[PDB]
Design a protein around this ligand. Structure first.
Ligand SMILES: NC(=O)c1ccc[n+]([C@@H]2O[C@H](COP(=O)([O-])OP(=O)(O)OC[C@H]3O[C@@H](n4cnc5c(N)ncnc54)[C@H](O)[C@@H]3O)[C@@H](O)[C@H]2O)c1
Ligand SMILES: NC(=O)c1ccc[n+]([C@@H]2O[C@H](COP(=O)([O-])OP(=O)(O)OC[C@H]3O[C@@H](n4cnc5c(N)ncnc54)[C@H](O)[C@@H]3O)[C@@H](O)[C@H]2O)c1
Ligand SMILES: c1ccc(-c2ccc3nc(-c4ccccc4)cn3c2)cc1
Lengths: 489, 476, 489, 476
């Protein structure tokens, strides 16, 4: 309902350290592109290790014992997340616009989804600030024993492009309610909203240095953070391989604590006794939502022989109806893909489906060649050791498979290494619970998809991540336990 | 004590059956106290690990007798095993001494008592591992289950072999997890015996698998095996870096590390010196100076520094030395001679810089030590006491914290503000006060900074042996 | 499978104080009867206030600061519950026999049900001993703040006859793992097992005075406890009216903390899409289990018009097949009723059902006149403002009602004041959860009945109780919170 | 300050509409400081309570806009109201002073700040009220929900009217519960105004209902109403006994009581007297000597007793007395004259027995007081300081604990063992150390023994406004 802001100008483009804007010590810069209209948006600073080293020495001092930040009341600190979520509320249209320009997200989605889940998250942890509680333990008669949940220190964050501002805030909200200091590196493809937030961080009244942002490239700024011996903890949302790199690097350097979220082969089981019109509608915007690029995307769609053939028919129509086009269009649901090797990579496995035996159903190739739009594709007769079904596609592709027994899909669903999310659609009570118990996903939606809450944790099983975000469990990743044991005369 | 106590178990333990290494090879653990040999032990390797892992996987899949037990049934077993260990207690302290050269009392009354208490404590957590029911919307049911991770890899050191092994097995077992255990090579005896007790109390086979071997051979195989979902390591810092590296490169498997560190020890002017000097003694020179909690540094205040160095020294050489099985002694020998060599050398490291030594081989006390020296800059990990002077509270806070090794710490004052002020500031997983080595199966152990990451020995221990699954249900 | 012990002799019959057996200061005594064979079992002491005053001065000293009990390690204390559950394990056949002699419980049930749930409960809280944990709170920069969960002190327990040993242990297990001292009064109808346990309490190694038992009558010993100004907390499982008396008394006397469990008009909803053969079998032994006398008994049985007529038919056969007879009989499920005014009271409302329009189905009156056995009765066409459906019958009676909409039964089910337990049988997912959410029972079984665990809490909604037993929540009722706030110079 | 500030609200507040008592009667709250009247206020009674209750029931039934809000939506409102109170802050401190005669600063910077902070603290708990997922069997799903109790009855005193009212409304509202509020009769003004703010921030009508009236008339109606599922009371001890009696006789409704008590205050030889004497001052004579936390007793050790009595007395009469709106003063008047009468009489109660008074009407300091006296045996509840001597730590422990009133307590030492040893032993809900009235919306308030039962002001506060439902599901 808000008016699209189509010629909004990029006002913020630099490294943000100690609440100040900076030109990269390198002097270099780099540009960010608008995937909707292949066009250059703006040129931002190109950070590197020297810049990163600059920001950490800032967070180190902002975290120093006795600093203005450390002294703050636990509630006063929680009072800043509030009033920084307030500011996000104010400039909600500005940020949603920035997010669309740089990502091709339908401006509708960026408003009611991305920035919604962002202001929500900022508020949940704003309340956790003064409720971070340790324990008092019974020990011996003569001993007092208790535990304090102290902040970890300088925490680095490295986010992806599929949800630039959201995935970032998921780490900033808990890390700051716990009393840490942060050095952030946003994905180069989408650094606009990360830096704009930097302004509000200053406007909200945060002490200088508690948060710093250094835009740059993965190897350049990213790796420099994962290894910095002064950063005490890392948070990474990205590719499973880079995830293996970050943790291994942090291992070699100072044994800093690391948490990872990597997405995976998220199964979408659909039993014979489901509300198909629901299962189709959710499994549809679950697979296709946000141009298809999402960690929780529905890679493999299982269906029972009882409604397998009927399902494939139902899905086909939804896919076609899904409008593709301008992001700032008010009637769009899917815009362009992110960048080039993505547009190419996606179109690759599409034919890999054609070329491997998968019965296509809708939209074999791309369209609207000016931009990077892809025809929402659907696949049938998919089998376990195919490519569309075995890999992590990103663009809109809905490979649908067949299954027969509940134990069959329980086994075939866990056959992967990527247990991040799993949907299940049944009106049955035991089928719904028996599945939810044996499925090895970190999250298990039932009769719904993409049901994230700043209250419920989100994390990966197996090779999908380490630890959880987005819950009360999120505080565990931003606090170090200290045991205090006193003996009395 | 038990004089000529035989050794019955030496083999790879898988599915409650004793196995010969597919390598067919064997290594011989020797008696560190009387340099002589005890027995040879099947040297496991990747093929052997390849079995136990797949064994644990089987005993862990759905429907397995292990997976299907009532939580209290799971806990009852841990209470059964801890009983057997309670029953065979002398035998273990015997092996622990025969295998590490530790005072048979220290082995009987500390190691095993901690093993026994730690086991019982987690038998109670079995049916008390609770998730959350989360408020989300009106028509939405949301909640989280704390499921077991799966096959867990445990790798222990020779410091407190069996205890270090329990600290991981106990909590890992009061959850779904099955295990594959690689003890040290200097000290594999007690770990192997416990495998007997494990089969004795009816743990369904494959739940626990012990595979003795070497560091780069068996340990390196676990930290990189793609079917092990979690690792718990306790040992050298640098060796931990590799396991975390390996785990990160292969399986993204969860890893929790218990490393070492230079553990500061602070004595304020208002200190009960007789307690401060004494506690600082058994916190440096206890168990032959080798221990994760040993105090590498000892900060003392001007008003007491000189007097502190005095009674430190006088009481320093009161520990008698002798045979492990002797009630006379509190200290035995060492295991390897890289420690011995690196200690007597380190002793002369502090002499190059200005450092006045207060009191060779067959129990040292250093003094007037600044921070910029080897005697205060490195993990001694051997009987040596580097004492330092200081004035301010903010002074020691920045000094003791300047290191990368926050594991433990000990403060000695009678003052309320000094006690708490120091406790809140010291960057250490544990912060003792007017005591040392005051460990409890109720309080979580673990380290700050590079001293490790993760926590054992508490309710926090459960966090490292469970994966959190969220379940979000919508209604119509 | 254990051999019934039919001439077991009552070896324990006296007040147990400071680990010693005593004759009532009154000098009086009273007898307990075996309802199976109207017969006198034995004569026990008759306690009164002076005896009660004796036991409290014992618990007061056993709880005194520095006593052997207070000094104990939290684990050592937990080590005593274990090894007292061990002893119960040993003499399991003795106690189950005692419980049958004095209550008419089928010796099968007393073994695998009563003493099972007793040894289970003793173990659960044995582990909670050294895991009773307070909190450490964030406050101001200069302040340390934390909470200790201290024991309350002398806690009195007053149990009923429907489950003498179980309902008692439910209070003793948590109260003792928390470090309190207890003064217990068992129901006069069933004091045998309460006193025998007293022996094991001493054998287990408990310090003298930590637990005391004074058998007697409600007004005599019971009221004397509820008012004693030295008892700090009460636990009462019994009738809703006596429950009103105890809390009001404790109110007038010293404001002692009180927890209550009173049973009620437990609804047993059965939807049209249930596994009837299950719903019937559970709703049957749910209504009829233990001669019908139970807090969780199924008073009102709702059924959907879709399977209403079919249900009533199915239930009828089960009821007839239910064998009534000798308790020590190995093929029995229901024995005699407890005592006289119960046998009369139950038989009253039976005709109240006949006389009010309720279509009888099986067993209108009693049988086997030697003892107090009743024919398992079933009723149809039951309506909301009848007597069998509106009251708290105890004997075997299964008034079955009709219902149509889910909202109809949600409203009609909460139409009472006794929300203790509620069963619900459906294969449906939403019907199962939507019901469980809106039903105002303290416990809500689904596709099952009588599913109690020493891990899950059991308590009453509305006028069915205050607080919970049988969970981790049980510790809240046996501990007082203390805030400690220290300011630093 | 605000000089001639008018009063706009005086009526029964139900469904966000202002109502005239079905009695048609009114009572007139007077200005305790300048004995004169402020306004008349609709005197509610059983018929009026009969409405608000049924109103709350409606706004609480399923599907009501209140029941159906997202937890965070519920919390957002509490953040909205606390903002309005933040916005109208002077107006409330004005009324609080106009209505109780309290220093307009004490009203503005304590009462309202506590009201504001307490509101925000519970706005955060709204979406963080989590139950458990319990391990039971293999084929069983078990878990507990923490549902709201329902219509909650709150009855406050004139000590800190609005604050005492928030402490109950705030947590009760960050749960399902709707409320019916009976403030005191001496001080109904601020409670009535907040009803305006409540309608202002869009709380769906019927969620909160304020019914001013008298103790035996409106309060007695609530404590016995059969549709109110819970009560929270803060006031006289004996009056609490009746509410618990009434609640037990009618509805078995849940009741949590915050009563008074004689709150010991201990000063050890190692005490920072300037802090001990000072804190003991504002912990007895603060807010005109009337307060639930006032220190009725003050145990001091021999080595400091005499000197303590000295500087206690010298600094005793430093509080200036004057008009409430004056920045000069820290103390105003009292409300009723049963307090005044019963105080000057109690002052001479300690003179009958041996008790030497150190320093009439228009600020007393007693001394040499044994325990067997009125000045140490009863709730003063008025400015009076009974000091006592003692030697042992175990001595004061048994003395201070011998009472039936454990509410608060204050220890003053610099020693670690003395501090903790006393903290663990004192039977009090709160045990301050080197401070007094150090209240926090994070730490739970409440009393031991007869000082009440239940806890406000913490995460424990949520326990008293939720009923635990267990859900056990079996699978086939
Ligand atoms: N170069 C190749 O051969 C090749 C092959 C396949 C795919 N790709 C590309 O992978 C990309 C996936 O990008 P994504 O956003 O989904 O996840 P990603 O892992 O590439 O990025 C996640 C975040 O981590 C940062 N990062 C990247 N590499 C890092 C490193 N070594 N160290 C530290 N930080 C690092 C990034 O700046 C980013 O912010 C696709 O665009 C595709 O074109 C490249
Ligand atoms: N006297 C009557 O008019 C009348 C009317 C109806 C029912 N009854 C009887 O009520 C009995 C119900 O017994 P129940 O075991 O189910 O529950 P209950 O309330 O009678 O007993 C529960 C426990 O509380 C004790 N107790 C009883 N009264 C007490 C009191 N005033 N103060 C303190 N403690 C007290 C009892 O000793 C018992 O252990 C039936 O047997 C029935 O015959 C009597
Ligand atoms: C983890 C690890 C070890 C322990 C543990 C077990 C037993 C134990 N005995 C002593 C002790 C020795 C001499 C004198 C007094 C006490 C210390 N002890 C520590 C507890 C938890």
């Amino acid at each position: 309902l808000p008016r699209p802001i189509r010629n909004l100008e990029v006002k913020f483009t630099k490294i943000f350290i100690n609440n100040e804007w900076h030109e990269s010590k390198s002097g270099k810069k780099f540009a960010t592109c608008n995937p909707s209209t292949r066009e250059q948006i703006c040129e931002v600073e190109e950070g590197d290790k020297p810049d990163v080293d600059k920001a950490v020495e800032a967070a180190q001092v902002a975290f120093q014992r006795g600093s203005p930040w450390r002294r703050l009341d636990a509630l006063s600190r929680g009072r800043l997340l509030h009033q920084l979520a307030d500011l996000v509320e104010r400039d909600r249209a500005t940020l949603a616009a920035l997010e669309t320009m740089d990502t091709g997200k339908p401006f509708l989605h960026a408003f009611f989804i991305d920035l919604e889940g962002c202001i929500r998250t900022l508020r949940y942890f704003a309340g956790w600030a003064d409720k971070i509680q340790g324990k008092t333990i019974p020990t011996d008669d003569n001993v007092v024993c208790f535990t304090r949940h102290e902040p970890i220190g300088v925490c680095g964050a490295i986010t992806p492009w599929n949800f630039p501002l959201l995935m970032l805030v998921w780490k900033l909200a808990p890390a700051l309610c716990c009393g840490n200091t942060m050095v952030l590196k946003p994905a180069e493809q989408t650094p606009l909203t990360a830096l704009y937030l930097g302004s509000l961080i200053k406007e909200a009244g945060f002490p200088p240095g508690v948060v710093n942002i250094v835009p740059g490239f993965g190897p350049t700024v990213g790796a420099a953070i994962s290894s910095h011996p002064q950063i005490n903890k890392i948070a990474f949302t990205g590719s499973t391989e880079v995830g293996k790199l970050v943790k291994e690097a942090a291992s070699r350097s100072n044994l800093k604590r690391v948490t990872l979220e990597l997405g995976g082969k998220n199964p979408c089981i659909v039993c014979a006794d489901a509300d198909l019109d629901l299962a189709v509608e959710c499994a549809h915007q679950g697979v296709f939502f946000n141009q298809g690029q999402c960690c929780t995307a529905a890679s493999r769609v299982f269906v029972e022989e009882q409604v397998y053939s009927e399902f494939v028919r139902r899905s086909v129509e939804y896919a076609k109806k899904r409008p593709v086009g301008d992001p700032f269009d008010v009637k769009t649901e899917q815009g362009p893909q992110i960048d080039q090797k993505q547009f190419d990579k996606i179109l690759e496995l599409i034919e890999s489906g054609k070329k491997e035996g998968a019965k296509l159903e809708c939209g074999g190739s791309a369209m609207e060649d000016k931009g990077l739009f892809i025809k929402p594709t659907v696949f049938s007769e998919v089998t376990d050791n195919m490519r569309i079904a075995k890999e992590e596609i990103f663009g809109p592709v809905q490979p649908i498979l067949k299954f027969k027994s509940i134990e069959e899909v329980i086994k075939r669903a866990n056959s992967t290494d990527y247990g991040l999310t799993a949907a299940v659609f049944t009106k049955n009570l035991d089928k719904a619970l028996k599945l939810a118990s044996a499925l090895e996903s970190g999250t298990v939606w039932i009769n719904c998809y993409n049901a994230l809450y700043a209250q419920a944790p989100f994390g990966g099983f197996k090779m999908s991540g380490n630890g959880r975000e987005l819950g009360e469990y999120a505080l565990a990743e931003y606090t170090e336990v200290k045991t205090v044991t006193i003996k009395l005369g």
